[PDB]
Amino acid sequence: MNVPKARLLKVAELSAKIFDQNFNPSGIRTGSKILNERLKGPSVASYYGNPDILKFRHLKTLYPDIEFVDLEEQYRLSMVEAKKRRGKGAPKKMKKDA
Amino acid sequence: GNFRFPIKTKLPPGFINARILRDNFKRQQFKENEILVKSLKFIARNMNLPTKLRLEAQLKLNALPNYMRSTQIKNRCVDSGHARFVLSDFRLCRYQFRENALKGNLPGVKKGI
Amino acid sequence: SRSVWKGPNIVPLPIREAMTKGTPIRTNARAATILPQFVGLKFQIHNGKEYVPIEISEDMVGHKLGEFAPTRKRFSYTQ
Amino acid sequence: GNINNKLQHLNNMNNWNTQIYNYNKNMEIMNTMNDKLINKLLYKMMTLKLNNMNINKIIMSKTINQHSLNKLNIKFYYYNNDINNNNNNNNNNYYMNMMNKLMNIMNNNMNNNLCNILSYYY
RNA sequence: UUACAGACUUAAGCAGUGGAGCAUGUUAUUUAAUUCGAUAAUCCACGACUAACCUUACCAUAUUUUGAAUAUUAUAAUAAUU
RNA sequence: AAACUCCAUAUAUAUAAUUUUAAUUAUAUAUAAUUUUAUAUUAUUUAUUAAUAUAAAGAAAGGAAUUAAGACAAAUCAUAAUGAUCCUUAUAAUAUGGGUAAUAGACGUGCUAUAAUAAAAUGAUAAUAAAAUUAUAUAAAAUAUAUUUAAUUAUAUUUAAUUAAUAAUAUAAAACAUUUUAAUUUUUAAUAUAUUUUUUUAUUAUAUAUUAAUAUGAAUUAUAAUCUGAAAUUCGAUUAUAUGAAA
Ligand SMILES: [K+]
Ligand SMILES: [K+]
Ligand SMILES: [K+]
Ligand SMILES: [Mg+2]
Ligand SMILES: [Mg+2]
Ligand SMILES: [Mg+2]
Ligand SMILES: [Mg+2]
Ligand SMILES: [Mg+2]
Ligand SMILES: [Mg+2]
Ligand SMILES: [Mg+2]
Ligand SMILES: [Mg+2]
Ligand SMILES: [Mg+2]
Ligand SMILES: [Mg+2]
Ligand SMILES: [Mg+2]
Ligand SMILES: [Mg+2]
């Protein structure tokens, strides 16, 4: 506390120089914090998982010899045909050209 | 042929719904533009630069699309898409957390004391 | 209350045309800060449904456009 | 005695379908998410068809994903009722039934084994 | 419908609720919209472990039309096979 | 089903070159109780018994989880999933702004307060915790401003250490001691006085109003500044000066 401020400022400046630190004696807002924050993009953008997963549609070309059946897809197609037979099918979609 | 978002994005590998697609798109574009937003924010908040350059950066920041905003990213359940009471340790909503926990799907989760 | 050191909340607006032609500026930027240049110009400010016509005076500088376009109707009970 | 012998108790690690510990919690969440997705995919690879009227459904249990420091082992139990050639002959020694073809792409296929595809995913 | 037993209750005790201001939920009413439940015990800081944008499910305006999926059939650009 | 059990607790062994130190600890294994024993008394279905007391031994005193059936066709189609039915240029999809925060009355649940067995300051060789958190971070010390010697509080500047039994969030708080405290003339002051002296006594002055709101209370509101964010107008948080409602 009795150490003159000039002496303590000389130590701060030299120390900052040796340790590659930003010396801002005035205290002006410099934005250095923004320049030092970490990039969270990679972590944020992987939230929902890796998109390059093997999918059932790729199995018919990876393994031509084997014939796989998608029961979930097959069930949906059967429900579509059933509704067509009862007359409860879907209306034909209007064309933008019209 | 007509993707709903301005830029082409790959689909998440698991459960999909409209809200998940919207959130995922914002996540990908935040990563592509994160550096740009930080650089403009620096120029706009650096008091050593002239006010004119600072105001130019602020104007550019206000003109960026909403899908580049970090504050618009919302954690959703990766299994159901529900966006309330989502545990970040598993990225699942409370109900899906309980169901997965009891099935032994969460690596080290057991029932409490 | 935006920190004064950050400056005004400047938004892209067509002020040059409104200063050389006198046309009203229709805008949805309710957050925009009324800058001292805007004084005298005519603005049409969205309130969620309609665009409220408002002319800017010298006592409006510093405030924001949204402050002059109320978004709700006055409450009334079926007494 | 019971818990101090490997033959008299079930290791608690087996109570979980994903057996993993990563210091990087994010990578652990990713591995857990990858294990559910692969489990779903494998369920879709169990139904096979030789002809329109010969659909063989293999019943698969949930996968046990053993994550060690160097490798991931995906262990699962499966049941298949061989209804196409359930004879007393040795004709099955001269062709690969659909279930053998499916099991041989997991590790044996030299060009497109599922392990190599998953090795890049993980 | 009988008897007994059990609690249920009551008592005692401590601090509160019910009164003031504010926070919050609900109702009612209003509103272009005031999203939707739950709504005696067993709803009412409940769903919701955080509504400025997002969230969002509502309203106004503008805009998109095989759309996020699978398959079929064409067309191309590309790499292998032959 | 009970239990067995797991947890807690007590003890033993093992592990730690006791500077990742908390060895007064950490966490693996095992042990222990559903306590036991005698003695007198009182009842009994009197016997190889209960209810009590008494002495003796012991650390021994607490919890957990899960379901068996059935009812409310109780809640949920808004965690996700299914049938039927309806929309398919729209009841699907995207953007900007707005709303979900409106306000007569009513209700539920909370917070703060209405003063003296109770509130406010101050307490640096730093009284005394536990359980958590920190790679989509936790942020030390220091310096600057508010702001005054300093401290305290808030923010800025800067970004030490630690991705952790190591460093940080973080010197726990109440407690306890001293001082102060409206209503209260139960006070304060001027003289004199004392073997109560941080005090006693005496004589003067110390208000009036007043069932009442103060140095209680902190709602409401003005102005300035700050924090997060691209953005704080509808509609966020904090600080300073001023305001000071009901109770
Ligand atoms: K809003
Ligand atoms: K008090
Ligand atoms: K505001
Ligand atoms: Mg958010
Ligand atoms: Mg919107
Ligand atoms: Mg909104
Ligand atoms: Mg020690
Ligand atoms: Mg609400
Ligand atoms: Mg007080
Ligand atoms: Mg201490
Ligand atoms: Mg400090
Ligand atoms: Mg202390
Ligand atoms: Mg104190
Ligand atoms: Mg006070
Ligand atoms: Mg009064």
From Swiss-Prot, chain A:
Signal peptide location: none
Molecular function via GO: structural constituent of ribosome
Protein name: Small ribosomal subunit protein mS33
Subunit structure: Component of the mitochondrial small ribosomal subunit (mt-SSU). Mature yeast 74S mitochondrial ribosomes consist of a small (37S) and a large (54S) subunit. The 37S small subunit contains a 15S ribosomal RNA (15S mt-rRNA) and 34 different proteins. The 54S large subunit contains a 21S rRNA (21S mt-rRNA) and 46 different proteins.
Keywords: Mitochondrion, Ribonucleoprotein, Ribosomal protein
Functional summary from the UniProt entry: Component of the mitochondrial ribosome (mitoribosome), a dedicated translation machinery responsible for the synthesis of mitochondrial genome-encoded proteins, including at least some of the essential transmembrane subunits of the mitochondrial respiratory chain. The mitoribosomes are attached to the mitochondrial inner membrane and translation products are cotranslationally integrated into the membrane.
Basic residues: bias regions: 84-95
Any single biological process term in GO: mitochondrial translation
Localization annotation: Mitochondrion
InterPro entries for this protein: Ribosomal_mS33
Family: Belongs to the mitochondrion-specific ribosomal protein mS33 family.
Superkingdom of origin organism: Eukaryota
Gene Ontology cellular component annotations, sorted alphabetically: mitochondrial inner membrane; mitochondrial small ribosomal subunit; mitochondrion
Swiss-Prot record, chain B:
Any Pfam family: Ribosomal_S14
Highest taxon listed in the record's lineage: Eukaryota
InterPro entries, per the entry: Ribosomal_uS14, Ribosomal_uS14_CS
Any one GO molecular-function label of the UniProt entry: structural constituent of ribosome
Keywords tagged on the record: Mitochondrion, Ribonucleoprotein, Ribosomal protein
GO cellular component: mitochondrial inner membrane; mitochondrial small ribosomal subunit; mitochondrion
Presence of the UniProt keyword tRNA-binding in the record: no
Any single biological process term in GO: mitochondrial translation
Record has Mitochondrion as a keyword: yes
Cellular compartment(s): Mitochondrion
PANTHER family: 30S RIBOSOMAL PROTEIN S14, SMALL RIBOSOMAL SUBUNIT PROTEIN US14M
Subunit comment: Component of the mitochondrial small ribosomal subunit (mt-SSU). Mature yeast 74S mitochondrial ribosomes consist of a small (37S) and a large (54S) subunit. The 37S small subunit contains a 15S ribosomal RNA (15S mt-rRNA) and 34 different proteins. The 54S large subunit contains a 21S rRNA (21S mt-rRNA) and 46 different proteins.
Job description of the protein: Component of the mitochondrial ribosome (mitoribosome), a dedicated translation machinery responsible for the synthesis of mitochondrial genome-encoded proteins, including at least some of the essential transmembrane subunits of the mitochondrial respiratory chain. The mitoribosomes are attached to the mitochondrial inner membrane and translation products are cotranslationally integrated into the membrane.
Family to which this protein belongs: Belongs to the universal ribosomal protein uS14 family.
The protein, known as: Small ribosomal subunit protein uS14m
Lineage: Eukaryota, Fungi, Dikarya, Ascomycota, Saccharomycotina
Designated gene of the protein: MRP2
UniProtKB/Swiss-Prot annotation, chain C:
Gene3D superfamilies: 30s Ribosomal Protein S19, Chain A
GO cellular component, one term: mitochondrial small ribosomal subunit
Swiss-Prot/TrEMBL keywords: Mitochondrion, Ribonucleoprotein, Ribosomal protein
Pfam family membership, one: Ribosomal_S19
Entry keyword annotation includes ATP-binding: no
GO molecular function, a single term: RNA binding
Signal peptide: none
Any one GO BP annotation for this protein: mitochondrial translation
Compartments reported by the entry: Mitochondrion
Keyword Transferase: no
InterPro entries, per the entry: Ribosomal_uS19, Ribosomal_uS19_CS, Ribosomal_uS19_SF
Location (main, coarse): mitochondrion
Family recorded in the similarity comment: Belongs to the universal ribosomal protein uS19 family.
Protein's job: Component of the mitochondrial ribosome (mitoribosome), a dedicated translation machinery responsible for the synthesis of mitochondrial genome-encoded proteins, including at least some of the essential transmembrane subunits of the mitochondrial respiratory chain. The mitoribosomes are attached to the mitochondrial inner membrane and translation products are cotranslationally integrated into the membrane.
Assembly with partners or alone: Component of the mitochondrial small ribosomal subunit (mt-SSU). Mature yeast 74S mitochondrial ribosomes consist of a small (37S) and a large (54S) subunit. The 37S small subunit contains a 15S ribosomal RNA (15S mt-rRNA) and 34 different proteins. The 54S large subunit contains a 21S rRNA (21S mt-rRNA) and 46 different proteins.
Record protein name field: Small ribosomal subunit protein uS19m
Gene encoding the protein: RSM19
Swiss-Prot record, chain D:
Keyword Mitochondrion belongs to the record: yes
Keywords noted in UniProt: Mitochondrion, Ribonucleoprotein, Ribosomal protein
Example of a GO MF term: structural constituent of ribosome
Compartments reported by the entry: Mitochondrion
Any one GO biological process: mitochondrial translation
Keyword Ion transport (UniProt): no
Membrane spanning stretches: none
GO cellular-component term (any): mitochondrion
Function per UniProt: Component of the mitochondrial ribosome (mitoribosome), a dedicated translation machinery responsible for the synthesis of mitochondrial genome-encoded proteins, including at least some of the essential transmembrane subunits of the mitochondrial respiratory chain. The mitoribosomes are attached to the mitochondrial inner membrane and translation products are cotranslationally integrated into the membrane. uS3m is essential for mitochondrial protein synthesis and required for the maturation of small ribosomal subunits.
Assembly mode: Component of the mitochondrial small ribosomal subunit (mt-SSU). Mature yeast 74S mitochondrial ribosomes consist of a small (37S) and a large (54S) subunit. The 37S small subunit contains a 15S ribosomal RNA (15S mt-rRNA) and 34 different proteins. The 54S large subunit contains a 21S rRNA (21S mt-rRNA) and 46 different proteins. uS3m, uS4m and uS5m form the narrow entry site of the mRNA channel.
Family the entry assigns: Belongs to the universal ribosomal protein uS3 family.
Name the UniProt record assigns to this protein: Small ribosomal subunit protein uS3m
Designated gene of the protein: VAR1
